[PDB]
Structure formats: structure tokens, C-alpha cells
Paper text:
In [name], [name], along with AtPRK1, AtPRK6, and AtPRK8, have been predicted as the receptors that sense the AtLURE1.2 peptide.
The [name] ectodomain contains six copies of plant specific LRR repeats ranging from 23–25 amino acid residues. There are two pairs of cysteine residues, C53 and C62, C224 and C232; they form two disulfide bonds in the CD and the CT, respectively. Two N-glycosylation sites are identified on residues N37 and N123, with only one visible GlcNAc sugar residue conjugated on N37 and two such residues on N123. Our size-exclusion chromatographic analysis of the recombinant [name] protein further supports the hypothesis that ecdPRK3 remains a monomer in solution. The [name] ectodomain contains six LRRs whereas [name] family members have five LRRs in their ectodomain.
Author numbering: 26 to 233
Amino acid sequence: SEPLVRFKRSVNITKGDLNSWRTGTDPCNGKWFGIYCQKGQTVSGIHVTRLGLSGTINIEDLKDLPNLRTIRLDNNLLSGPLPPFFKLPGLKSLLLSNNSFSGEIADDFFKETPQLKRVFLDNNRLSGKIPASLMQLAGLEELHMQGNQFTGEIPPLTDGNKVLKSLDLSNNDLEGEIPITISDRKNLEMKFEGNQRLCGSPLNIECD
Ligand SMILES: *[C@@H]1O[C@H](CO)[C@@H](O[C@@H]2O[C@H](CO)[C@@H](O)[C@H](O)[C@H]2NC(C)=O)[C@H](O)[C@H]1NC(C)=O
Ligand SMILES: *[C@@H]1O[C@H](CO)[C@@H](O)[C@H](O)[C@H]1NC(C)=O
């Protein structure tokens, strides 16, 4: 569990240090900063933030951690397309706040990620239509996508979801009627401000 983690460290970091993720030491000894471990034995989360990570994530390295469940890479400089996080089958928490990931996410990106409870993609530069499969996750509880450049209509949310309690789509450029699959729910903190073109809604604008 040491060599793949330091494959992942060896991309591009511009602010701060390892320090350290030594290749010949166990990452659950308690010295490895920013690592979480199930039961003091195996790696289950990566939590590294504000290091100016400017390189590229190679998810084949992260696939060699079989019980990794949480990734939190908030406030770095990661850019390019969104890496294929769907290749990690047990992933529960994907936190990539304030990075610079760009481009359109494949609509089928979340077809085979039923374990995801939390997806924070806010304040990147993602574009082009929220993937419909994201809104088909029955177990998605927290989805924060504010501050991107998403366009098009919001996909409907499946009735199979009974746990979504926080949805933030503010400050994008979304268009259609806000789906009543979302707005009817009485336990859902939802946010849609700063989305001109958007109507229906908890917002006070018809639609039409
Ligand atoms: C994403 O970036 C913003 C900008 O820094 C963070 O929001 C600010 O957070 C500071 C705390 O350091 C607050 O004092 C400001 O009021 C916040 N400003 C705004 C406009 O929200 C935000 O927390 C970052 N997201 C994460 C997860 O760290
Ligand atoms: C990583 O850094 C090296 C030099 O430090 C550079 O050649 C390479 O292009 C960088 N890659 C990314 C994705 O920033």
C-alpha cells in the first residue's frame, strides 16, 4: 500500500511537501499525513488539500487500493478532464472542491458507481449538461456542483433515491424547468440561484 500511493504522489505538487510518504514505510503507521485507514491496517481515504497539486491523477494507481472509499483533493490546481473515478468501485465520497477540472462529463459517467454518497465538484470549470446517470444514483445524499459552467436542463432524479438531503446547483448556466422530482421533496436543502434561464422551481419564476 506504499508504492502505488507514492506513484500517485509523484505527479506534480507545487506548495508543500510529502512529508513524508516514504516508499519503505507503512501508510497506516500514523505518520502519513492526509491518509485514512480502516482498522489501522488498510488505506481507505486520501485527504490532501492546499498543496497546489498541478499534475494529473492516474486512477490506475488508486485502483490498487482495494478498500479506498474516500477521496478529498480540495483547493488545489488540478485541471484537464475529470479523471475516470468510476473505475474505483467502492468509492463513497468524491470531494474535489475548488479545482480547475474542465470539459463535459460523460453522461454515463456514474452508471456503475452506486456506492457514491457524496459528490462535491463545486467551483471547477466543468461544462455541458449534468450527466443523467448522476441523478439516477439511489444512494446519493450530497451533490454540490455550484460555480461551474453547466448548461442544459437538469436531469430528473430517480424515485429510488430517498436520501438526497443537500443539492447545490447554484451559479451555473442551467436552462430548463427545475425537475419536480427534485422540488417536491420536503427534506431537501436545494439551491438554484444564479442560474438565469432556469425556471419553475422553488424559484419564483414561471415557466412559462
Ligand atoms: C472554495 O473557494 C471559496 C473562496 O475562497 C471558499 O469560500 C470562502 O471561504 C472563506 C474561508 O476561508 C470565507 O471567509 C469566505 O466567505 C468564502 N467565500 C465565498 C464566496 O464562499 C470556499 O470555502 C472554498 N471551498 C472549500 C470547500 O474550501
Ligand atoms: C509535471 O511537471 C513536469 C516538470 O516538473 C512537467 O514536465 C510536466 O508537464 C508536468 N505535468 C503536468 C500535468 O503538469
